[PDB]
């Protein structure tokens, strides 16, 4: 399950990163 895990966790972390990026960049607008 080498390849399965590696290039499924790649897009897994894609989703995770976009998730946290938006959840960090919204309260920015709130206090702004």
């Amino acid at each position: 399950r080498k390849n399965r895990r590696l290039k499924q966790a790649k897009e897994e972390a894609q989703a995770e990163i976009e998730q946290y990026r938006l959840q960090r960049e919204k309260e920015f607008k709130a206090k702004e």
């Binding site: 590696l6 790649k10 990163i17 946290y20 960049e25």
Partner: peptide, 24 residues
Amino acid sequence: AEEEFNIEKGRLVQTQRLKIMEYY
């Protein structure tokens, strides 16, 4: 199998959380 994606998530999560924190 497990370790591969384990440290994969670790590395990419860290190296992107650092960036987004610095930016914001």
